[PDB]
Paper text:
Intriguingly, the autophagy adapter p62/[name]/[name] was recently reported to recognize N-degrons, the N-end rule substrates of the well-characterized UPS, and where ultimately these substrates are delivered to ALS8,9. p62 is a key selective autophagy adapter that plays a role in the degradation of various cellular constituents such as misfolded proteins and their aggregates, malfunctioning organelles, and invading pathogens. Intriguingly, it was recently reported that the central ZZ-domain in p62 plays a critical role in the recognition of N-terminal arginylated BiP/[name] by the Arg-tRNA transferase ATE1. Here, we present the high resolution structures of the ZZ-domain of p62 in complex with 8 different N-degrons including type-1 and type-2, and subsequently identify key determinants involved in the unusual recognition.
Numbering used by the authors: -3 to 45
């Protein structure tokens, strides 16, 4: 079966918990740590659980 998963573009790891997906770029996501460290911070992101 094809499983769906969100890999953080900052630490190449999985996105567990809050997903911060960029509203500008296509297909860009950050985990809470990379988001909290200011990666990709000038683009608006959708923070959903
Ligand atoms: Zn990360
Ligand atoms: Zn972006």
């Amino acid at each position: 079966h094809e499983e769906e998963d969100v890999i953080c573009d900052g630490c190449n790891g999985p996105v567990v918990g809050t997903r911060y997906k960029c509203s500008v770029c296509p297909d860009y996501d950050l985990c809470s740590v990379c988001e909290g460290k200011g990666l990709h911070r000038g683009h608006t992101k959708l923070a959903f659980p």
